[PDB]
Each structure stands twice: as structure tokens, then as C-alpha cells.
Amino acid sequence: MISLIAALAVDRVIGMMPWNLPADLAWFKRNTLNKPVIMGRHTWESIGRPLPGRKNIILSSQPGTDDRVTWVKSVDEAIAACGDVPEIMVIGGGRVYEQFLPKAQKLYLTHIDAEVEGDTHFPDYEPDDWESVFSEFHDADAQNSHSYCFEILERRHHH
Ligand SMILES: Nc1nc2c(c(=O)[nH]1)N[C@@H](CNc1ccc(C(=O)N[C@@H](CCC(=O)O)C(=O)O)cc1)CN2
Ligand SMILES: [Cl-]
Ligand SMILES: [Cl-]
Ligand SMILES: [Cl-]
Ligand SMILES: [Mg+2]
Ligand SMILES: [Mg+2]
Ligand SMILES: [Mg+2]
Ligand SMILES: [Mg+2]
Structure with a gap:
């Protein structure tokens, strides 16, 4: 099963x-x-080093050379590279x-109480197609700059 x-x-x-x-x-x-974990090449370059304790799969039509990660060229190949596992992130x-998103059945979202200047957005999803099965709000504190709300959603419908 695929989750975002x-x-x-x-x-x-x-x-x-x-x-x-x-x-x-x-x-x-x-x-x-x-x-x-499946990520695009921009995200991979921003992280810089493989996330430990996870198979790192990089989706890119133009792979890099780094042998520390697994390079794939399509969504289908990315999924195949994961094989038989309970959950792909x-x-x-x-x-x-x-x-x-169309292939996903679960979302793990952190809703951050910040207004910011960026131009890259998470995809549109139809809230009516999902059920909120967990939500937890946390205030900012000495270690965390903003308040945030964790949420997990499970897919109920597909269009
Ligand atoms: N929810 C959540 N989801 C996310 C991001 C996030 O920001 N938080 N940002 C994007 C993913 N990017 C990263 C990059 C680096 C790390 C990272 O470095 N993680 C350490 C934990 C950090 C640490 O304490 O060392 C780890 O082992 O997972 C996590 C997400 C997309 N999704
Ligand atoms: Cl990316
Ligand atoms: Cl505190
Ligand atoms: Cl946690
Ligand atoms: Mg190689
Ligand atoms: Mg989009
Ligand atoms: Mg869309
Ligand atoms: Mg319904």
C-alpha cells in the first residue's frame, strides 16, 4: 500500500x-x-544523504550516479523496486x-500554522474522499518554532 x-x-x-x-x-x-521511501531528485539533493533504516528510492528520468540509493525512472518502476512490503512511503x-496521490490509500499530514513565501504546493485532494482517523494539535515551544497539527487520513473514495 502507498502512503504520502x-x-x-x-x-x-x-x-x-x-x-x-x-x-x-x-x-x-x-x-x-x-x-x-520514494522521493524525486530535487528532494534527494536537498536531503543529501540516505535516510537511515529505510530503502531510499529516487524517481528521476535522469538518474544521478550515487550508488547509495536506488534510481528508478517511473512510478511503476519505483513501486516494483519496493517489492512485497506492507507500506511504501x-x-x-x-x-x-x-x-x-491516485495510487495512495493513506496520508500523513502535518498542518503547520505558518504563512510562508514558497511556490511548491502539495496536490489537491478531495476531502470528501478521505476520512480523518487521527488528529493531534501541538503548541509551539522552546524547541518548535510554530504550532502544528498531525493528521492521518485513510482513503474512502476514488475518482
Ligand atoms: N512530516 C514531514 N513530512 C515531510 C517533510 C517534513 O519536514 N516533515 N519534508 C519533506 C521530506 N524531507 C525530509 C528531509 C530530511 C528529513 C530528516 O532529516 N529526517 C530525519 C529526522 C531528523 C533528525 O532528528 O535527525 C529522519 O531520520 O527521518 C526528513 C524529511 C516531505 N515530507
Ligand atoms: Cl522532488
Ligand atoms: Cl518550552
Ligand atoms: Cl511522533
Ligand atoms: Mg551505480
Ligand atoms: Mg501539484
Ligand atoms: Mg491534481
Ligand atoms: Mg463517503
């Missing part, structure tokens, strides 16, 4: 960080550890989320 995981500012702006949220990074790690960026 993303952190969204107001207006669904995503980035590679205008905010400083170690709690969100802990949420990201907890929910991706021991699962393959798609970690962005904008275009990769857009291509994978």
Missing part, C-alpha cells in the same frame, strides 16, 4: 525550512522507519506527490 507523508504550511505550501519543528521530524522518522516533492 508531507508537512504543509498555509495554502498547502511545502518546502525542502521556514519552520523549525524537531517534533515533526520525529513524527516523520517514526512513520517512515523500516519502510521504503512517498516523501515528495510536489510533482512526485501529484503523480502518486
Whole structure:
């Protein structure tokens, strides 16, 4: 099964960080550890080093040479490279989320209370097609710059 995981500012702006949220990074790690992660080449270059404890699959029509990750050229190849696993995590960026959304059955979202200047957005999804099965709000604190709300949604309908 395919899931997307993303952190969204107001207006669904995503980035590679205008905010400083170690709690969100802990949420990201907890929910991706021991699962393959699929990302586009822009996201890969922004991370710079393979995420530990996860198979790192990079979707790009023009692969790099880095032997530390697995390079694939299509959504279908990305999925095949993951093989028989319970859950595949798609970690962005904008275009990769857009291509994978139709195949996804679960969303892990962090809704951040920040207005920011970026131009890359998380895909449009029809809220009526999803059910909110978890939500938790957290205030900002000495370690986290903004307030945020974790949410998990499960797909109920497809169009
Ligand atoms: N929800 C959440 N989802 C996201 C992002 C986020 O920002 N938070 N940002 C994008 C993914 N980018 C990264 C880049 C680096 C790391 C990262 O470095 N993670 C460490 C945890 C950080 C640490 O404490 O060292 C890890 O092992 O997962 C996580 C997401 C897309 N989705
Ligand atoms: Cl957590
Ligand atoms: Cl990308
Ligand atoms: Cl505090
Ligand atoms: Mg090689
Ligand atoms: Mg889009
Ligand atoms: Mg769309
Ligand atoms: Mg319904």
C-alpha cells in the first residue's frame, strides 16, 4: 500500500525550512522507519544523504550516479523496486506527490500554522474522499518554532 507523508504550511505550501519543528521530524522518522521511501531528485539533493533504516528510492528520468540509493525512472518502476512490503512511503516533492496521490490509500499530514513565501504546493485532494482517523494539535515551544497539527487520513473514495 502507498502512503504520502508531507508537512504543509498555509495554502498547502511545502518546502525542502521556514519552520523549525524537531517534533515533526520525529513524527516523520517514526512513520517512515523500516519502510521504503520514494522521493524525486530535487528532494534527494536537498536531503543529501540516505535516510537511515529505510530503502531510499529516487524517481528521476535522469538518474544521478550515487550508488547509495536506488534510481528508478517511473512510478511503476519505483513501486516494483519496493517489492512485497506492507507500506511504501512517498516523501515528495510536489510533482512526485501529484503523480502518486491516485495510487495512495493513506496520508500523513502535518498542518503547520505558518504563512510562508514558497511556490511548491502539495496536490489537491478531495476531502470528501478521505476520512480523518487521527488528529493531534501541538503548541509551539522552546524547541518548535510554530504550532502544528498531525493528521492521518485513510482513503474512502476514488475518482
Ligand atoms: N512530516 C514531514 N513530512 C515531510 C517533510 C517534513 O519536514 N516533515 N519534508 C519533506 C521530506 N524531507 C525530509 C528531509 C530530511 C528529513 C530528516 O532529516 N529526517 C530525519 C529526522 C531528523 C533528525 O532528528 O535527525 C529522519 O531520520 O527521518 C526528513 C524529511 C516531505 N515530507
Ligand atoms: Cl511522533
Ligand atoms: Cl522532488
Ligand atoms: Cl518550552
Ligand atoms: Mg551505480
Ligand atoms: Mg501539484
Ligand atoms: Mg491534481
Ligand atoms: Mg463517503
